[PDB]
């Protein structure tokens, strides 16, 4: 069951696995944002931009649209550079593309939530919706997921009682 030898990747894995185990199948027992931050500090993963990727894969389920805007202060404290945001988008890509393909149609609404709450920058959303990448998922999976962003990307591009 456990990893036997420690690494930066095993620390990320241990953080994600702790979230998953704590949270339950319906994310009904998610640790509080205070607990999520303190555990990240304990496991020494705050300084790793890939923490964004882990969080995006562990916090959410089919109710992602309703959940993704419920951690604003936490994301301001965690996603401390654009590389953390890029990795968060990669985690969304893995979440939608690999194990929850039925949720891919939610991508534009997910982007609307991230945009309206300034969780992810316009630049990072544009990057995600205009390029495919092999970095987070296989190329064909990347194309499938990112193509679903198109209506929001088009909206971004063309954007008294």
Curated annotation (Swiss-Prot):
- Phosphothreonine-modified residues are 81
Domain W2, first and last residues per copy: 5-159
Anything else known = Present with 48300 molecules/cell in log phase SD medium.
Q: What does this protein do?
A: Catalyzes the hydrolysis of GTP bound to the 40S ribosomal initiation complex (40S.mRNA.Met-tRNA[F].eIF-2.GTP) with the subsequent joining of a 60S ribosomal subunit resulting in the release of eIF-2 and the guanine nucleotide. The subsequent joining of a 60S ribosomal subunit results in the formation of a functional 80S initiation complex (80S.mRNA.Met-tRNA[F]). eIF-5 is essential for cell viability.
Write out the similarity annotation: Belongs to the eIF-2-beta/eIF-5 family.
Describe, as the record does, how this protein assembles with itself and its partners.
Monomer. The factors eIF-1, eIF-2, eIF-3, TIF5/eIF-5 and methionyl-tRNAi form a multifactor complex (MFC) that may bind to the 40S ribosome. TIF32, NIP1 and TIF5/eIF-5 comprise a minimal 40S-ribosome-binding unit. Interacts with NIP1. Interacts with SUI3.
What is this protein called in UniProt?
Answer: Eukaryotic translation initiation factor 5
Q: Which organism is it from?
A: Saccharomyces cerevisiae (strain ATCC 204508 / S288c)
Classification lineage: Eukaryota, Fungi, Dikarya, Ascomycota, Saccharomycotina
Full-sequence range covered = 241 to 405 of 405
């Amino acid at each position: 069951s456990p990893e036997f030898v420690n690494s930066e990747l095993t620390q990320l894995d241990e953080y994600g696995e702790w979230i998953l185990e704590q949270a339950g199948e319906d994310k009904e027992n998610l640790p509080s944002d205070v607990e999520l931050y303190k555990k990240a500090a304990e496991l020494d993963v705050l300084n790793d931009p890939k923490i964004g990727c882990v969080l995006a894969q562990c916090l959410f389920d089919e109710d992602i649209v309703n959940e993704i805007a419920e951690h604003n202060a936490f994301f301001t404290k965690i996603l401390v550079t654009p590389e953390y945001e890029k990795n968060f988008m990669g985690g969304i890509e893995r979440f939608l593309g690999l194990e929850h393909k039925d949720l891919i149609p939610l991508l534009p609404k997910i982007l609307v939530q991230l945009y309206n709450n300034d969780i992810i920058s316009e630049e990072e959303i544009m990057r995600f919706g205009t390029k495919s990448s092999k970095k987070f998922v296989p190329k064909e999976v990347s194309k499938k997921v990112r193509r679903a962003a198109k209506p929001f990307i088009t909206w971004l591009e063309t954007a008294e009682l």
